Design a binder for this molecule. Structure first.
Ligand SMILES: [Zn+2]
Lengths: 104, 100, 100, 50, 147, 86, 126
């Protein structure tokens, strides 16, 4: 995973009404998210999920070239009857350990 | 949590008020990252002024030493709680236990 | 005279001006580095506030004049980070600003 | 600042961090930087070392 | 020779430039009272010459270095004019004092003198008149090259 | 430049030789405006230019007038370093 | 150039003229600039008001200055003071040089003086 743009959120150090988790725990859960891509070198993934329950790996809008490997990997729990998340997950190739500060 | 504990971690975790403890025994109604809502059980419910318990968690604020003090929900929804039990893991607290 | 808070400044580039609002205040969440400008503060050095002979001749000639200086709050050197909150306190009887 | 080891050094030398070096030797940077003519005037060198 | 508008536009950039570099003066003077003496008075003569940002002043510093690196005399009088803000006649005096009886041979005859202060004016003037004309299309593209 | 350090007890007229004036008034600054006063502690005309080559009233604003005292308060134009030791 | 008897003559006429107008005894129809000055507060004053509005109709800036000096009664030094306050940088072949900057106060005093003398000069035969 490279970077995530969740919708109604200014920045990582705040919350979102409708989820039990903080933003920070969510994207650290996404740091462990594994996926397989074939035809590209970068790709943007998208999830849209409402309703009470856990947010699994299944709720992304999958394609034919991308492939999640662990469908059970949880992200968060929606707690509201009517709330949703809509992030866009940018994913690219790479090699090694790259912190966020050393870029550009 | 630390593996080699010393048994005191419940006590110092509770008595430090940087965690948020259920004042009455109840059942969780509504979990949120910011607030938390408890349905009060009937026995501990006062006859007049029935009411429910609403606790508001402390989010990111500046400490005395410029560090992050923050509280997290450690409970699920639809769940019996006990009077005098931990609800919010505050900073360096885990599941009611103190952990540096 | 007083001092002002707005995004009007003398003689810095548009780089720091990119990250303020219309009121002269950084948005919540704009990541900044050291030496960046948080709030553009300026002083009117040379403000007049004179007799209605002045305001007469200001109505005659126009209001062009009395604009100088700057004392913007700048980020300390070497530190960086992310804005998470803005607090504004306003003395009573003073006009509150838009972001306030 | 705070000391640490780095045993790979020979003993006629010590480690030193790049930030503290770039702060401590600023007038020498001005001097040789004027010499090479990478910047003529001084305030040019000020913004170059900044 | 250059034109009138070019002289204006380039002239404004150069006074912003030498104003900027003049702020990199080595040391001033002042005191520990005078600032307190200063904020509650209206001074009068605002000596605060305005300057550009560091991007423009650095950029056109690279421009002026990029052409004017070949003559240090013309560069020096350039900094005299915009940096210190001194007049043409003033550096006609400074320069005329130490112009050095270099035995320049005039249309009068063989002479051992400074060229006159009446001479040294048009000496100065033909320098920077050519100099701005030299550097102008370079700089005018240079803002466009960033653009 | 100089050899040994010599001390001695102070003669009165030696102290008169050291001074440039007598202090007379127990104020130091204006507090209303921010001026130093006539013959208070922080004095100009005893101690010198609080500004730099310039008078209190600003009568002699340039380096050309160097040498002559003022007249609206009577201060000699010198550096502001000179108020460190008079 | 005018003479000094013309100066004192028409000077006294502008004194009773501005003292007449500034009381508010003049109508909007003489000028919208006279109306502008009346937004900022007998046949002799109306005859002269036709004269002065006729000659100084075309500039309106020194006409307003003329109202400031005569109608309101302002000192010359304050007028040049505010005029130096509203100054823009201009090209003048200065004592300093042909650089482009805000002029000095004494220059502004000179300009109020010459716009005074030229104003009175253009008024007087009318
Ligand atoms: Zn004086």
């Amino acid at each position: 995973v490279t970077e995530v743009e969740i919708d109604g959120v200014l920045h990582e150090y705040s919350t979102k009404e409708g989820v039990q988790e903080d933003i920070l725990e969510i994207l650290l859960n996404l740091k462990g998210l594994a996926v397989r891509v074939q035809g590209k070198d970068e790709v943007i993934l998208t999830l849209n999920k409402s309703g009470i329950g856990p947010v699994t790996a299944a709720d992304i809008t999958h394609d034919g070239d991308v492939e999640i490997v662990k469908p059970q990997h949880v992200i968060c729990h929606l707690t509201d009857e009517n709330a949703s998340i809509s992030m866009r997950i940018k994913v690219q190739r790479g090699r090694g350990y790259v912190p966020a500060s050393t870029r550009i | 949590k630390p593996l080699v504990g010393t048994g005191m971690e419940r006590a110092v975790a509770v008595d430090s008020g940087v965690t948020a403890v259920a004042k009455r025994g109840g059942v969780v109604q509504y979990v949120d990252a910011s607030r938390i809502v408890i349905k009060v059980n009937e026995d501990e419910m006062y006859p007049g002024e029935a009411g429910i318990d609403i606790y508001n968690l402390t989010k990111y604020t500046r400490s005395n030493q410029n560090t992050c003090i923050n509280q997290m929900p450690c409970v699920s929804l639809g769940e019996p709680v006990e009077r005098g039990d931990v609800l919010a893991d505050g900073p360096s607290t885990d599941l009611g236990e103190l952990a540096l | 005279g007083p001092e002002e808070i707005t995004a009007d400044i003398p003689n810095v580039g548009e780089a720091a001006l990119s990250k303020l609002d219309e009121s002269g205040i950084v948005y919540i969440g704009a990541e900044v580095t050291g030496g960046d400008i948080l709030v553009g503060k300026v002083t009117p050095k040379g403000e007049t506030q004179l007799t209605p002979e002045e305001k007469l001749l200001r109505a005659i000639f126009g209001e062009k004049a009395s604009d100088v200086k700057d004392s913007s709050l700048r980020v300390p050197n070497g530190v960086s980070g992310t804005v998470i909150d803005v607090q504004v306190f306003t003395r009573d009887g003073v006009e509150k600003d838009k972001r306030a | 600042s705070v000391i640490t080891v780095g045993p790979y050094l020979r003993l006629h030398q010590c480690g030193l961090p790049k930030k503290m070096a770039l702060e401590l030797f600023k007038p020498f940077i001005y001097g040789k930087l004027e010499l090479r003519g990478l910047a003529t005037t001084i305030k040019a060198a000020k913004k170059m070392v900044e | 020779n250059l034109t009138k508008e070019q002289h204006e536009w380039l002239n404004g950039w150069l006074e912003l430039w030498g104003a900027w570099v003049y702020s990199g003066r080595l040391e001033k003077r002042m005191s520990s009272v005078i600032a307190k003496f200063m904020e509650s008075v209206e001074p009068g003569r605002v000596m605060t010459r305005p300057m550009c940002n560091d991007d423009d002043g650095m950029l056109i510093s690279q421009v002026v270095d990029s052409v004017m690196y070949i003559d240090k005399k013309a560069f020096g009088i350039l900094l005299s004019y915009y940096a210190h803000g001194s007049s043409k006649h003033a550096i006609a005096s400074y320069y005329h004092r130490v112009a050095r009886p270099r035995k320049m041979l005039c249309r009068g005859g063989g002479r051992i003198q400074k060229p006159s202060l009446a001479t040294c004016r048009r000496e100065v003037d033909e320098i920077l008149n050519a100099s701005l004309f030299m550097i102008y299309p370079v700089l005018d593209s240079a803002f466009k090259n960033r653009k | 430049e100089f050899d040994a350090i010599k001390i001695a007890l102070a003669s009165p007229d030696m102290i008169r030789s050291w001074s440039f004036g007598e202090v007379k008034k127990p104020e130091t600054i204006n507090y209303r405006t921010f001026k130093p006063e006539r013959d208070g502690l922080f004095c100009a005309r005893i101690f010198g230019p609080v500004k730099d080559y310039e008078c209190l009233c600003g009568k002699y604003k340039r380096l050309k007038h160097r040498g002559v005292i003022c007249e609206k308060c009577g201060v000699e134009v010198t550096q502001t370093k000179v108020r460190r030791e008079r």
